[PDB]
Design an enzyme around this catalytic site. Structure first.
Site, short mmCIF file in Angstrom:
data_model
loop_
_atom_site.label_atom_id
_atom_site.label_comp_id
_atom_site.label_asym_id
_atom_site.label_seq_id
_atom_site.Cartn_x
_atom_site.Cartn_y
_atom_site.Cartn_z
CB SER A 38 3.10 5.61 -1.00
OG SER A 38 1.97 6.78 -1.67
N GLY A 39 1.04 2.77 -1.24
CA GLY A 39 0.36 1.94 -1.92
C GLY A 39 -0.87 1.75 -1.10
CB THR A 55 1.47 9.77 0.76
OG1 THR A 55 2.51 10.89 1.14
CG2 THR A 55 0.35 10.12 -0.03
CG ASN A 80 -0.95 -1.30 -3.00
OD1 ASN A 80 -1.20 -0.33 -3.69
ND2 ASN A 80 -1.19 -1.26 -1.68
CB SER A 101 4.87 0.15 -2.54
OG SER A 101 5.56 0.03 -1.27
CB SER A 102 8.61 4.26 -0.69
OG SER A 102 7.38 4.39 0.48
N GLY A 115 4.51 -2.99 4.22
CA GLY A 115 3.32 -3.68 4.75
C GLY A 115 3.58 -5.25 4.46
CD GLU A 133 3.51 -6.36 0.30
OE1 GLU A 133 3.20 -6.51 -0.56
OE2 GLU A 133 3.11 -5.63 1.12
#
Ligand SMILES: Nc1ncnc2c1ncn2[C@@H]1O[C@H](COP(=O)(O)OP(=O)(O)O)[C@@H](O)[C@H]1O
Ligand SMILES: [Mg+2]
Lengths: 70, 531, 369, 57
Positions: free
Chosen positions: B38-39, B43, B78, B81-82, B304, B306
């Protein structure tokens, strides 16, 4: 009548045996807690006495060191 | 409805529908590979893609608002984030009409609970409960409403002006209710979530002339004990003298203060994670089905890649997870292109594209690699941070062609050792790693947990070389890749334009980094060097 | 997941690598029937092992095959190996590396043949015997200090600093655990009871298990329990009788602190450990006094930690802090450390694979450990 | 009749042992409170004599 009297006395003996077994196990647990508590208080009494004698020695060491320092 | 992949304008609804066609033909599962979180502004894509697939139902989204609260975590870069993986599958029978969609989470970030980075912030739910709004639940939960009171929270910033759950607590509570929750379980969830905070007040002293730990601060332990119902005295005792079995289980005993401070946190982390998974089970429960559903096409969301400043263990774990999926991709595309070029068989360049990643997979995982060294180091006596890096330098410098050292990283605090991944050279400082991964799952408290509220017994009744986050993590990732080993992939990505959020216009500084990180450039590298 | 199986004479304990608790522990008795068979069709077992054998001591003779850290009468100790692997832990050795344990220096030929017997018949993949004390150290997470395990068969000290096993001060002593039991036999003959046979000789260590606490200022406590009847304790045999033990209660363990009773002319353990302290440099004594760790068995006697602290602080210069580490994880610390050591990945390269033994001959254990 | 007497004897001996346990546990609970206080006073005296001996030197 004699069979009925016997069976009631046998049931009473089984009830007293159950109560005696319960009392005997709780007696054993009370005795086990008592011997553990007796051992632990005696051991801790030796340790606190040792620490207290070392405190008296530490006070004597402090008092002579302050006298010599002065 | 056709046009396999190169017969229609670029469009992903096409490829998803082609996956539907594969289902019709091969009758075999399919997997959606969503990169970015979502970052990354994603979404709003699969929320539509899933309805698209259902076209050829709305209960699927309803889980999202609540499960986000225990799973969204704001990071250094960012934010919001989930960080938890939630593989999501939709089941079809042989017919093709949707029967049900069950959801299983994978590789949740279990170490986020404690020793979060000072710059970052904890799970959203913690600050949801924090805000005085809906104070009656706080009255149930006996919390003082002050973030900095507790040990776990005080590491966090707790002041993020961009997004707070102050309004969101209403939406999360409403969903968490309307998802079929009795009020008893409803407030019990709060009870456990609060208690997980509430341990943070626990304080211990070092015993005289001895080693084990006595409990200090009886009142907060007692408030916790009431909160989970179980007695305080036996809880603190089971803390100070855990039971370890023998050929007959005498009440063996032994602990140290350091071990205790580690272990209670371990227990909190485990109970929270297992709580979360049980909520997933309940979400399955309110969505239960009884139709013949057997063939599913699954969408999985993963953290994602990192790369940013001051990256500890957590980043290493997440990056390893993210790149293993790229290993999976490389092997898959290699298989298909292998048979295709085989039909045109002349000669292949270099079999098993997966070697490019295996060269670093061995370094991270393969016995006495890196991850194994932390496992060994926590066990070994007197865990000291510097000795860890000394051992690494002794063992894998020059000996391993992917383990090297950075130099003068300009303003970001000094990292110790570096690795050359394809996506980006990574830099870490290993401070606090030995603390991070040490987590002894104390048994006696676990067995003590059965005689309390319905939740905790229900959670912890269902289920050893001193499990540490590394091992659990490796095993779960192997489980996930196994589930993908038994499927077929396809790839859907997301791109962020800019921080200023100006749609329609590019902004190069960002997109280059995400494209390089996402590994699409690595796939282009594969194509470029090859046939 | 290899394995870890203690050798110690008292209680052969078996478990798995990494696990924090031995999976199965049993006394190392080996038994043979000492009477003719009378009820035809029993299908008598020709020998018995472990707690099964301990179950029916009534018609059994007991051989301990392990005395003073030397493995004697190898036939029965091999029998114990066989019973362990298959019945207690229940896996064929063919798929499990195995680690054993051994007292500091017992003989030379012991390991050099024991590796052979356990490595040629059981056909184990790999093995490595590790000296007791260094393993005990690992078990407690302290990589510096002196170990006093006193496993029932033998008692010994090592100085270990900063993780170096400083050899020359290793001070072994044969004041074994069993010999406290044997002396208690002679001291219990006096109160009028009698324990001639072997079965009763096994019982008495059990009766020793509870009723032996070592007490400071032995003279004053002795005269104390002599004058007053305060501690007159009772206990019962699985016979019906009840036995009353007086000052023998705290005259048992003190054979450790002075051997004049048993007769052996080698100073008590506290003086030996102080000796081994004073046989190192003048800079290692700074820390050694501070990390003193008990280990093994035979030190679960209450008080022995404190009595030891008193004796050492009296002997050592009264400017050091002698706070001794006696966790209640004793009697197993051997095995915990063994499991942890087997769990170390770097340790994997050490032990001996079958190839090396086959191509090198038996001495490989001594040469490579 | 024998079991009736035995039950009364067993309950009497239970209370005598539990009273003895209660006295010993009550005394050691007070002694556990005192020992850390005397050890803290010893640690204070030890710190004071060490700095006094250093200042004397
Ligand atoms: N209750 C007890 N109190 C004190 N010592 C005991 C008790 N029970 C057993 N022991 C002693 O522990 C000894 C076992 O120690 P040992 O065999 O030397 O170590 P290991 O079993 O690790 O090889 C037994 O010989 C026994 O004398
Ligand atoms: Mg033994």
């Amino acid at each position: 009548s004699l069979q009925k009297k016997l069976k009631g006395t046998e049931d009473e003996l089984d009830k007293y045996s159950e109560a005696l077994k319960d009392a005997q196990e709780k007696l054993e647990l009370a005795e086990k807690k008592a011997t553990d508590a007796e051992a632990d208080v005696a051991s801790l009494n030796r340790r606190i006495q040792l620490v207290e004698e070392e405190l008296d020695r530490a006070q004597e060491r402090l008092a002579t060191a302050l006298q010599k320092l002065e | 409805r056709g046009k396999k992949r190169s017969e229609a304008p670029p469009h992903i609804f096409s490829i998803s529908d082609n996956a539907y066609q594969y289902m019709l033909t091969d009758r075999e599962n399919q997997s959606i590979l969503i990169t970015g979180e979502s970052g990354a502004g994603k979404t709003v894509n699969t929320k539509r893609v899933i309805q698209y697939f259902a076209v050829i139902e709305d209960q699927i989204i309803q889980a999202n608002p609540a499960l986000e609260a225990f799973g969204n975590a704001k990071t250094v870069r960012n934010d919001n984030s989930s960080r938890f993986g939630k593989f999501i599958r939709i089941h079809f029978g042989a017919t093709g009409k949707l029967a049900s969609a069950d959801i299983e989470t994978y590789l949740l970030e279990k170490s986020r609970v404690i020793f979060q980075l000072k710059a970052e912030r904890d799970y959203h739910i913690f600050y949801q409960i924090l805000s005085n709004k809906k104070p009656e639940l706080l009255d149930m939960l006996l919390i003082t409403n002050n973030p900095y009171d507790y040990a776990f929270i005080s590491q966090g910033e707790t002041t993020v002006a961009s997004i707070d759950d102050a309004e969101e607590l209403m939406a999360t509570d409403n969903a968490f209710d309307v998802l079929g929750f009795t009020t008893e379980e409803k407030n019990s969830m709060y009870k456990l979530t609060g208690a997980i905070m509430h341990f943070g007040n626990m304080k211990f002293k070092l015993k005289q002339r001895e080693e084990q730990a006595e409990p200090d601060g009886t009142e907060e332990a007692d408030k916790s004990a009431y909160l989970m119902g179980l007695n305080s005295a036996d809880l603190l005792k089971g803390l100070c003298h855990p039971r370890v079995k023998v050929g007959n289980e005498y009440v063996t005993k032994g602990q140290n203060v350091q071990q205790v401070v580690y272990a209670k946190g371990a227990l909190a982390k485990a109970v929270y994670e297992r709580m979360f998974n049980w909520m997933v089970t309940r979400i399955n429960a309110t969505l239960e089905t009884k139709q013949p559903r057997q063939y599913f096409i699954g969408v999985l969301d993963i953290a994602g890649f990192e790369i940013f400043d001051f990256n500890s263990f957590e980043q290493l774990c997440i990056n390893f997870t993210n790149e293993k999926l790229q290993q999976f991709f490389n092997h898959h595309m290699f298989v298909l292109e292998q048979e295709e070029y085989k039909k045109e068989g002349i000669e292949w360049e270099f079999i098993d594209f997966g070697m490019d990643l295996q060269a670093c997979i061995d370094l991270i995982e393969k016995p006495m690699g890196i991850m194994s060294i932390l496992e060994e180091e926590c066990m070994f006596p007197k865990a000291t941070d510097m000795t860890f890096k000394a051992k690494l330098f002794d063992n894998h410098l020059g000996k391993s062609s992917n383990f090297q050292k950075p130099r003068n990283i300009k303003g970001k605090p000094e990292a110790h050792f570096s690795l050359i991944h394809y996506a980006g050279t990574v830099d870490y400082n290993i401070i606090g790693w030995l603390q991070k991964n040490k987590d002894p799952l104390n048994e006696t408290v676990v067995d003590l947990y059965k005689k309390s509220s319905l939740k905790m017994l229900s959670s912890l009744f269902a289920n050893s070389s001193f499990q540490t986050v590394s091992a659990l993590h490796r095993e779960n990732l192997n489980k996930l890749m196994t589930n993908l080993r038994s499927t077929h992939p396809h790839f859907v990505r997301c791109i962020i334009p800019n921080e200023t959020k100006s749609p329609g216009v590019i902004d190069n500084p960002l997109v280059m980094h995400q494209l390089r990180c996402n590994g699409v450039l690595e796939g282009i590298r594969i194509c470029r060097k090859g046939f | 997941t290899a394995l870890v199986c203690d050798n110690g004479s008292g209680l052969v304990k078996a478990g798995f690598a990494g696990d924090d608790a031995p999976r199965a522990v049993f006394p190392s008795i080996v038994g043979r029937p000492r009477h003719q068979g009378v009820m035809v069709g029993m299908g008598q077992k020709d020998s018995y092992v472990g707690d099964e054998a301990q179950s029916k001591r009534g018609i059994l003779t007991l051989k301990y095959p392990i005395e003073h850290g030397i493995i004697t009468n190898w036939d029965d100790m091999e029998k114990i190996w066989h019973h362990t692997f298959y019945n207690e832990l229940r896996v064929a050795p063919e798929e499990h590396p195995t680690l054993l344990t051994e007292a500091p220096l017992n003989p030379k030929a012991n390991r050099e043949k024991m590796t052979q017997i356990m490595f040629e018949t059981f056909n184990v993949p790999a093995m490595y015997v590790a000296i007791q004390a260094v393993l005990s150290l690992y078990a407690s997470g302290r990589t510096t200090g002196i170990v006093l395990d006193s496993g029932d068969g033998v008692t010994h000290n090592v100085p270990i600093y900063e993780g170096y096993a400083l050899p020359h001060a290793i001070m072994r002593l044969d004041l074994a655990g069993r010999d406290l039991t044997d002396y208690l036999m002679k001291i219990l003959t006096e109160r009028g009871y009698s324990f001639v046979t072997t079965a009763e000789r096994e019982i008495v260590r059990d009766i020793k298990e509870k009723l032996c606490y070592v007490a400071l200022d032995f003279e004053n406590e002795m005269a104390t329990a002599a004058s007053s009847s305060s501690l007159e304790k009772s206990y019962e045999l699985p016979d019906g009788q009840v036995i009353t033990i007086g000052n023998e209660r705290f005259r048992c363990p003190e054979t450790l602190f002075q051997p004049s009773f048993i007769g052996m002319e080698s100073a008590g353990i506290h003086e030996t450990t102080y000796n081994s302290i004073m046989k190192c440099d003048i800079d290692i004594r700074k820390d050694l006094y501070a990390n003193n760790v008990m280990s093994g068995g035979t030190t679960m006697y209450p008080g022995i930690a404190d009595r030891m602290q008193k004796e050492i602080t009296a002997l050592a210069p009264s400017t050091m802090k002698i706070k001794i580490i006696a966790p209640p994880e004793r009697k197993y610390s051997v095995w915990i450390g063994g499991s942890i050591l087997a769990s170390l990945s770097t340790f994997q390269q050490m032990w001996i694979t079958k190839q090396e033994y086959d191509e090198a001959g038996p001495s490989i254990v001594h040469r490579k450990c």
